[PDB]
């Protein structure tokens, strides 16, 4: 008899009250508004869209949960921009100009010494 | 500048505070279970009990809390050896892109390496990584080789390209065309060998010297 | 699912289980850990380019032939030839098994684009614009970078195009290699089967069934019997999660090493020996593989040597 582990999706109280739950693997007319059957289970409460957008809220297996404009919304994320570089067989672009950019990089080194 | 405006991120650094916050307050709570014991207090179930009967029950609560502190530590010798891994990706780094330039490719930020500064975070580093990034690209018509007297012309350094009209050599990494000549090119071979080589003139200076 | 696991269905049994404190919290905490990090494990290798090139349709490049590599149009899936090998070489009690977030029509777009970046704009692209240039001039770049002079690309331009060609197609020979994928599936498995039986033992109790101690014994002794179940049981996830998370490591190291190739031997041209494939690194074309990734190293091998006088 089905089972399923049980997660709730929240955009954060500081934010809004709302949640969705996914049942994992669980049909949607075995688990006893927006219901969208996806191959990793059955999610409730949020609208399944053919849009992309980046992942917010991982949900698994190409699918993304977030908050638009006062709502959940579950669409499938996207890969980037597309874009054709210019080849041919006698052509080159060479740069006439640059930047100097500056970015961060994080490490840990170290934790806390306990004893007991 | 506007590295402070993206501060004012070290999740990474937070994260170990947490890890080790939790398995400190895990461990403390771990005392108050009675492991299917009589109680969990070992004064309890010592006043009231007798040498040979309150043997047994204290033995139950030692087993548990032995094995609590064998998850414990056991877990930190893995999560260690996470930190210790990082802390060697961390020195690695302070010697190849703060005491040195580096040739390799996203080691020290993204784009081609210049320079890097470090700065202290608790329990941490943080690397700021300065790089040079070109920009505002044109194209142009090239040519592997230019044909001059019956031979072929290669580029010391460059490449070939035209802008319409004439050809020029450049610097790979940076517009600024100059002439063809003697000195900017070598010989090697003849033309018909090369795929898509091209006529053009390649000066001398010798000959306007001796006018 | 702990409570699944050591019980079972039983409801007797889960106030029991309630006297030994958050065990079952700390195998989901420690559990949900690997799980996070085994998605991110495939994005650093792999989301490494921030648009989807794609290549030309003519696909002729100086004469390279790249069609082993590249998708095949003619295909639901739109892998590549090499890669449709390389796929075909390789629930319980409270168990499950998580789809992954990328799907693996997804990861062969990141390689597509890998590869129609480098054969029209080279190692550019990683770090800014995409600047393209013929392809021939490309390859005379790649061994002026390890000390030959670029005629000799130039002048030899079709017997290295030649040589190439059928260099590359050697490759599907020796594969129509792969234990190290297959090994990571057994392991898995193998600690999944023995969790499952591991279940049928009595450690010591009159049976291994927490309903049949009811059915044939009264409570006081009932919750003795069913207590050493559960610390047995419970022994068993903890030995199963101790394993996967020494076991994770191994894979996050692998993953570190795969994302670190995929910069430095993909998007670049690397002088480190040995650490792109064996001779003068000049290039190299990754492909996908099911939980791994298979680097196509070409590299420069100088051959036929004559002795001579030296001053
Ligand atoms: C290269 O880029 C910089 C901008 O990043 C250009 O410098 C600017 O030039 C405009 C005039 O075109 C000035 O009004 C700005 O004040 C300049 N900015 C700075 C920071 O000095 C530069 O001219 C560009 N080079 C070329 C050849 O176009
Ligand atoms: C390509 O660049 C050349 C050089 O700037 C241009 O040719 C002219 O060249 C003569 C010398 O031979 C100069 O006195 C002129 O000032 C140049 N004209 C210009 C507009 O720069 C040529 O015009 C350029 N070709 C194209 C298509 O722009
Ligand atoms: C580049 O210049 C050379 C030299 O002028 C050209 O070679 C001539 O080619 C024509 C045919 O196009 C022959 O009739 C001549 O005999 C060749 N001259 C010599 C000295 O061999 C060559 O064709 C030119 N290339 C292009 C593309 O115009
Ligand atoms: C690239 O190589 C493939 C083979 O790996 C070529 O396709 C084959 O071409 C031969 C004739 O040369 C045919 O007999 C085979 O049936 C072809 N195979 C397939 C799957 O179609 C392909 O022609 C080459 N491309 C170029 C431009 O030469
Ligand atoms: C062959 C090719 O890619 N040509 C493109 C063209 O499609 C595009 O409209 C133009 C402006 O972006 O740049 C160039
Ligand atoms: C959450 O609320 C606090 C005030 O209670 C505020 O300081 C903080 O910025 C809020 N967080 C977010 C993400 O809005
Ligand atoms: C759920 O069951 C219905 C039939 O009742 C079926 O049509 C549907 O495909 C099932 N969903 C899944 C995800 O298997
Ligand atoms: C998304 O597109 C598919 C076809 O690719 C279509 O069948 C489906 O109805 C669309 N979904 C929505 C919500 O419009
Ligand atoms: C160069 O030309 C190609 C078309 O051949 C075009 O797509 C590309 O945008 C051009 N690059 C620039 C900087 O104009
Ligand atoms: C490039 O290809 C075009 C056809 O698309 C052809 O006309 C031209 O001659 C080619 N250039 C070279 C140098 O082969
Ligand atoms: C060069 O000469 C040595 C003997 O001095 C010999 O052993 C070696 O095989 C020769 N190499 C070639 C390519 O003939």
């Avoid at chain 1, 053919?50 to 638009?68: F, K, L």
């Avoid at chain 3, 648009?51 to 002729?60: A, E, G, L, R, S």
């Avoid at chain 3, 393209?132 to 770049?141: K, L, N, S």
């Avoid at chain 3, 999660?241 to 994302?259: F, K, M, P, W």
């Amino acid at each position: 008899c089905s089972f399923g582990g049980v997660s709730v999706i929240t955009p954060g109280t500081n934010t809004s009250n709302q949640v969705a739950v996914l049942y994992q693997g669980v049909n949607c007319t075995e688990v006893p508004s927006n219901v969208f059957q996806t191959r990793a289970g059955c999610l409730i409460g949020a609208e399944y869209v053919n849009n992309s957008y980046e992942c917010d809220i991982p949900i698994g297996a190409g699918i993304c949960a977030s908050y638009q404009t006062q709502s959940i919304i579950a669409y499938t994320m996207s890969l980037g921009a597309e874009n054709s570089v210019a080849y041919s067989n006698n052509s080159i672009a060479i740069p006439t100009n640059f930047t100097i950019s500056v970015t961060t990089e994080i490490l840990p080194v170290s934790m806390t010494k306990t004893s007991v | 500048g506007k590295i402070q405006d993206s501060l004012s991120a070290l999740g990474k650094l937070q994260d170990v505070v947490n890890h080790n916050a939790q398995a400190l307050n895990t461990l403390v709570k771990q005392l108050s279970s009675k492991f299917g014991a009589i109680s969990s207090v070992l004064n309890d179930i010592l006043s009231r009990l007798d040498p040979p009967e309150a043997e047994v029950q204290i033995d139950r609560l030692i087993t548990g809390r032995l094995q609590s502190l064998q998850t414990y530590v056991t877990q930190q010798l893995i999560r260690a050896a996470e930190i210790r891994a990082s802390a060697n990706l961390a020195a690695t780094k302070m010697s190849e892109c703060v005491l040195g330039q580096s040739k390799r490719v996203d080691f020290c930020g993204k784009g081609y390496h210049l320079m890097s500064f470090p700065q202290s975070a608790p329990h941490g580093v943080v690397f700021l990584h300065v790089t040079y990034v070109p920009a505002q690209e044109k194209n142009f018509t090239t040519a592997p080789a230019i044909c001059h007297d019956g031979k072929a012309h290669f580029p010391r350094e460059g490449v070939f390209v035209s802008n319409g009209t004439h050809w020029f050599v450049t610097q790979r990494n940076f517009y600024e065309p100059q002439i063809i000549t003697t000195d900017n090119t070598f010989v090697s071979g003849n033309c018909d060998v090369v795929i898509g080589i091209v006529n053009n003139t390649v000066y001398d200076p010798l000959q306007p010297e001796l006018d | 699912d702990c409570t699944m696991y050591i019980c079972g269905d039983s409801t007797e049994c889960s106030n029991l289980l309630l006297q030994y404190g958050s065990f079952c919290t700390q195998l989901k905490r420690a559990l949900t850990g690997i799980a996070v990090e085994q998605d991110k494990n495939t994005q650093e290798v792999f989301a490494q380019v921030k648009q989807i090139y794609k290549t030309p349709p003519i696909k002729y490049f100086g004469g390279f032939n790249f069609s082993q590599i590249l998708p095949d149009p003619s295909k639901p899936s739109k892998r590549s030839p090499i890669e449709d090998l390389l796929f075909n070489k390789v629930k319980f009690n409270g168990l499950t098994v998580l789809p992954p977030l990328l799907t693996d029509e997804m990861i062969a777009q990141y390689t597509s684009a890998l590869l129609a970046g480098t054969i029209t704009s080279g190692w550019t692209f990683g770090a800014g614009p995409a600047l393209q240039i013929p392809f021939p001039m490309q390859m005379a770049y790649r061994f002026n970078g390890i000390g030959v002079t670029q005629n000799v690309l130039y002048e030899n331009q079709k017997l290295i195009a030649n040589q190439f060609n059928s260099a590359i197609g050697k490759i599907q020979d020796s594969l129509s290699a792969l234990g190290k994928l297959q090994d990571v599936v057994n392991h898995n498995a193998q600690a999944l089967n023995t969790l499952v039986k591991q279940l049928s033992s009595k450690f010591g109790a009159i049976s291994s069934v927490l309903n049949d101690i009811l059915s044939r014994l009264d409570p006081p002794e009932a919750e003795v019997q069913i207590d050493r179940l559960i610390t047995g049981r419970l022994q068993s996830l903890q030995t199963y999660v101790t394993q996967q998370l020494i076991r994770a490591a191994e894979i996050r190291a692998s993953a570190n090493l795969a994302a670190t190739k995929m910069s430095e031997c993909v998007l670049g041209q690397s002088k480190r020996v040995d650490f792109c494939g064996k001779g003068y690194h000049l290039m190299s074309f990754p492909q996908s593989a099911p939980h791994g990734v298979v680097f196509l190293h070409v590299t420069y091998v100088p051959a036929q040597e004559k002795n001579f006088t030296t001053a």
